[PDB]
């Protein structure tokens, strides 16, 4: 009946339409701060000198952008990894030129998304569930840490973190390939394997359950009405599904146990995306994809090109053009 | 910007017409029960 105790009960109440919790206590403010700032920046921020060369890049809608080209532009390379809150700027006008809003958005976001994961554990504990859904979400969350925090740390600048924008995303992934040969990196190959494999298993599982719905409706109604929320019986015949997919391949490459099957669906895309997030995290310290440039030569010693050398030519065209004004010396070492 | 002027009528119709369709069928679904 005491005040702190009543507040604590509201915080952890399983009766709120949306659950708060102690992790929610941090996430809500930080996600509103990031969200409100993002929305205003995207619409109305003036251009930002991302590359520190007094060459500002316009990213907002009122400054000539559309939905596809707009972005909140990364903070200036003159700042590097230095902290740049609003209160370190002579004025909001300076803060905006130097890319201040990016730092605000990504820090509040990563915080609240970290608490978002915590909140997945917390409410699971309050409902008497098993706890590990948050482990699954850690694969995407790790990916966001990689492109917004980790890659900027090892390269030395928040100016090489991913723009918050559709074309800026593409700028980021082009430059990454020229500098790290990410395609030739095994961890990116596993992320593809995870992400193609995930989409395939999503379709396979969805088509196979959908193929074995037990008849419960007529031709004039959505079969979906054959399931009622909270029914005790299962709504498809898995033996029949096993019987079909077993024969489409062979009996033993198909699941007859639903628990192994659903854990399989969980594990495959999660693991693969751990790796592709680790790939971005480790190419931040410039341990790059395989390099077979000129690995093949003839008896005289001529280069005999492979497809790797062709890749390298494309990579070069990226190298020499990106941030065309920002390099005064022959090597781009970060 | 020097943008396509039918862009606006195009977007509005792209949005309005499928939407009104969905609404019309929804509201008459509710009027049954």
């Amino acid at each position: 009946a005491n005040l702190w105790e009543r507040f604590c009960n509201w915080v952890t109440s399983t009766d709120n339409r949306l659950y708060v919790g102690w992790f929610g206590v941090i996430m809500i403010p930080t996600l509103l701060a990031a969200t409100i700032c993002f929305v205003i920046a995207f619409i109305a921020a003036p251009p930002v000198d991302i590359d520190g060369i007094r060459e500002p890049v316009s990213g907002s809608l009122l400054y000539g952008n559309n939905i596809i080209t707009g972005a909140v532009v990364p903070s200036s390379n003159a700042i590097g990894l230095h902290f740049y809150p609003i209160w370190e700027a002579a004025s909001l006008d300076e803060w905006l030129y130097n890319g201040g809003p990016y730092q605000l958005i990504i820090f509040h976001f990563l915080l609240g998304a970290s608490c978002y994961m915590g909140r997945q554990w917390e409410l699971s504990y309050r409902l008497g569930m098993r706890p590990w859904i948050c482990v699954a979400y850690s694969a995407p969350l790790a990916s966001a840490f990689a492109v917004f925090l980790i890659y900027p740390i090892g390269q030395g600048s928040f100016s090489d973190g991913m723009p918050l924008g559709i074309s800026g995303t593409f700028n980021f992934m082009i430059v990454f390939q020229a500098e790290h040969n990410i395609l030739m990196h095994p961890f990116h190959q596993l992320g593809v394997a995870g992400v193609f494999g995930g989409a395939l298993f999503c379709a396979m599982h969805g088509s196979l359950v959908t193929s074995s719905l037990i008849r419960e409706t007529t031709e004039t109604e959505s079969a979906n009405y054959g399931y009622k929320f909270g029914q005790e019986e299962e709504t498809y015949n898995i033996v029949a599904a096993h019987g079909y997919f077993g024969r489409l391949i062979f009996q033993y490459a198909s699941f007859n146990n639903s628990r192994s099957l659903h854990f399989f669906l969980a594990a495959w895309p999660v693991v693969g995306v751990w790796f592709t997030a680790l790939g971005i995290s480790t190419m931040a310290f410039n341990l790059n994809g395989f390099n077979f440039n000129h690995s093949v030569i003839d008896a005289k010693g001529n280069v005999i090109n492979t497809w790797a050398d062709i890749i390298n030519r494309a990579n070069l065209g990226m190298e020499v053009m990106h941030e065309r004004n920002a390099h005064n010396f022959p090597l781009d070492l970060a | 910007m020097e943008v396509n002027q039918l862009g606006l009528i195009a977007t509005a119709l792209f949005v309005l017409v499928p939407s009104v369709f969905l609404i019309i069928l929804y509201v008459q679904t509710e009027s049954q029960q």
Binding site: R17, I43, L61, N66, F229 | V3, G7
Partner: peptide, 30 residues
Amino acid sequence: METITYVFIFACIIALFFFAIFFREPPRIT
């Protein structure tokens, strides 16, 4: 007018979010 069109659609999605959550058809058991 391009700016206006983009913001209006985005705004509408946020309002649809609102109704989809607080004004969903409520799921009911057995």
